[PDB]
Amino acid sequence: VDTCSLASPASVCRTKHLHLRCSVDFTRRTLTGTAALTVQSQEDNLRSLVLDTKDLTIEKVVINGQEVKYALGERQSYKGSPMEISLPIALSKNQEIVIEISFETSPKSSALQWLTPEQTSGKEHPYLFSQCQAIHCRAILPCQDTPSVKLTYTAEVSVPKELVALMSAIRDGETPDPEDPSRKIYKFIQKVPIPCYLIALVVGALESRQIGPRTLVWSEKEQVEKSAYEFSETESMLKIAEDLGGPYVWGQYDLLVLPPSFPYGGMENPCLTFVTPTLLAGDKSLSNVIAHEISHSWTGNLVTNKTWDHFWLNEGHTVYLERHICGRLFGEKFRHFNALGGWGELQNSVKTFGETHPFTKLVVDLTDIDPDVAYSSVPYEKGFALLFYLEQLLGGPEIFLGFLKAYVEKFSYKSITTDDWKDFLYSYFKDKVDVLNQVDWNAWLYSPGLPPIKPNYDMTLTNACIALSQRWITAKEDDLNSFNATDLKDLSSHQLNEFLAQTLQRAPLPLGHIKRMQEVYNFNAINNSEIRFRWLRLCIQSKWEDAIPLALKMATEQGRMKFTRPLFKDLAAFDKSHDQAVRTYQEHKASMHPVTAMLVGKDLKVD
Numbered sequence: 001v002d003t004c005s006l007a008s009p010a011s012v013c014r015t016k017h018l019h020l021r022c023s024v025d026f027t028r029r030t031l032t033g034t035a036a037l038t039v040q041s042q043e044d045n046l047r048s049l050v051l052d053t054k055d056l057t058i059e060k061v062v063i064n065g066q067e068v069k070y071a072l073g074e075r076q077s078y079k080g081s082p083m084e085i086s087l088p089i090a091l092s093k094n095q096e097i098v099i100e101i102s103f104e105t106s107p108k109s110s111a112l113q114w115l116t117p118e119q120t121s122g123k124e125h126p127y128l129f130s131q132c133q134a135i136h137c138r139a140i141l142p143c144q145d146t147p148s149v150k151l152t153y154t155a156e157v158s159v160p161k162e163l164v165a166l167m168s169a170i171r172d173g174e175t176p177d178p179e180d181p182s183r184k185i186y187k188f189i190q191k192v193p194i195p196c197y198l199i200a201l202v203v204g205a206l207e208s209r210q211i212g213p214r215t216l217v218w219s220e221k222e223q224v225e226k227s228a229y230e231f232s233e234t235e236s237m238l239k240i241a242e243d244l245g246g247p248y249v250w251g252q253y254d255l256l257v258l259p260p261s262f263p264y265g266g267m268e269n270p271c272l273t274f275v276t277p278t279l280l281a282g283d284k285s286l287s288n289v290i291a292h293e294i295s296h297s298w299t300g301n302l303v304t305n306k307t308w309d310h311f312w313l314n315e316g317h318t319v320y321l322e323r324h325i326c327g328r329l330f331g332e333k334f335r336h337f338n339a340l341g342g343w344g345e346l347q348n349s350v351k352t353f354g355e356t357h358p359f360t361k362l363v364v365d366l367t368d369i370d371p372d373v374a375y376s377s378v379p380y381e382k383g384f385a386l387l388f389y390l391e392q393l394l395g396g397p398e399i400f401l402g403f404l405k406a407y408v409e410k411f412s413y414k415s416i417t418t419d420d421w422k423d424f425l426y427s428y429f430k431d432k433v434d435v436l437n438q439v440d441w442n443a444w445l446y447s448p449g450l451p452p453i454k455p456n457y458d459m460t461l462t463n464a465c466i467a468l469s470q471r472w473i474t475a476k477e478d479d480l481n482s483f484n485a486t487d488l489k490d491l492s493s494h495q496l497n498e499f500l501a502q503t504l505q506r507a508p509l510p511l512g513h514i515k516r517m518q519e520v521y522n523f524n525a526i527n528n529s530e531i532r533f534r535w536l537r538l539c540i541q542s543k544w545e546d547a548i549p550l551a552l553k554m555a556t557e558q559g560r561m562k563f564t565r566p567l568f569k570d571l572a573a574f575d576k577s578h579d580q581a582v583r584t585y586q587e588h589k590a591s592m593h594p595v596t597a598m599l600v601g602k603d604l605k606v607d
């Protein structure tokens, strides 16, 4: 059972296909049109079914040429309102019908962000983007809003002729709109069955440049050149992902670089990965996020978590694969560097939540929890830590990668639970079931806090970061003169980032140490978003007032929640910046991404 969904379960009926015809109305900030659902009954004598909606206005429902009865139940908070449809003729098991729902979204759709022209790069045209994961697809169209159901889809999207629509699908043509010469209809086909959270739409003033044999980058004109360079490694990452996971089944691997309020670093929308523009560091240093998104083309998009309680299946497997691609490209010691850094991110998250907090369990029961509220690094990093532990336990990377490849072949086009995965792990490693029985399964999967066992990590690239950080923490005033620009001489951006992650773990530092750090390292000049983020955090937490406007500016000039949430929270806990933080949030709130707005508001304990 999917406790985040109010729709009929897959055991009652299944959506096989969606045909979406819609029009994007920037004047009303609505999307209007029809969702035609091809539904297969899984039950005998089926007379009604229930769908997910959230702030949709239903016009009518039509089956076999005629309108039918439907009722909207009461809203259940973030789950929205269930829509019961009365079927005109009872269905037999495996019978299929098409149900056509005429609907319109609200301007307040939690799946959508509408941007004015001044919120974009070109300043001439508005922009729309979606973000359905986890349970916002219902806020766009009526559906069984559960990753336990996979469907194909086709879509026809009408938009102002001077704009471009793109979706998570192969582009299937464009023509003028017959019903309105000021408009174009773009057509789309997704031939691979996907959970509905993978449904994606963007409409904006978009251009494209080709960067590999099966990759275009898309963005507003003024981002194209930079994006083309930043992601040039994409094809070669793809080939390595294909070697590890098996064939890329989706045809195209395009990239869309979004405006800065996109809430995530990336979203693995099939055929068209959405990325944050905070990735555009100038040096390709943040390309693990492409590897991450690429890896989802197997782990998540091919084998899918059955409910959001099993989200670690998606995330931990993708992080595991992400780190193998980066290890191939840049060496096994880099894989261990990033693995150990992820363990540190896990320490931070368990420390922030508290070591007995339910959101620190690998598998969580999301029954009355908004997935957006529960979201964090835990499923990523505790997930990854589990697989890195099993890897070392069961014979090393080459052996565990054979399991990952087999696990993907086994569960392609399906949705699975943690037990499905563990049963399969036991089948695959039949000859190592004694070794498997040494694992504390209950603790790893179901207990809060840090895992019961820590993997073994090569420290080679980490040591210089730890050494430098310890110099700064143990320094007294008479030691600050000895710090120098040359200290950073032999550190990559990655190591500079880890240096700051380490120091931030012991924050606050004395204010004089942080002022000195800016004197000798000029971290204020670094535009790498990861580095700048943790530097500004270290500053605000060490109570440097000069950093207030720098932190406020980063918090609001981009909306990647990874950065935006902890910057506002740090700004709010700093007494000197508190009132300004709360005030800046209130000013920007109405033009923020609706989910980021919600979560920052809760973080600040405002409204």
Ligand SMILES: Oc1ccc(/C=C/c2cc(O)cc(O)c2)cc1
Pocket (backbone or CB within 6 Å): 132, 133, 134, 135, 308, 309, 310, 311, 312, 359, 360, 361, 362, 363, 364, 371, 372, 374, 375, 376, 378, 379
């Ligand atoms: O966009 C989103 C996508 C996925 C989710 C899932 C969150 C979640 C967090 C956990 O600690 C455990 C878990 O099983 C699930 C939330 C938002």
Ligand SMILES: [Yb+3]
Pocket (backbone or CB within 6 Å): 476, 478, 479
């Ligand atoms: Yb001294």
Ligand SMILES: [Zn+2]
Pocket (backbone or CB within 6 Å): 292, 296, 314, 315, 318
């Ligand atoms: Zn992911």
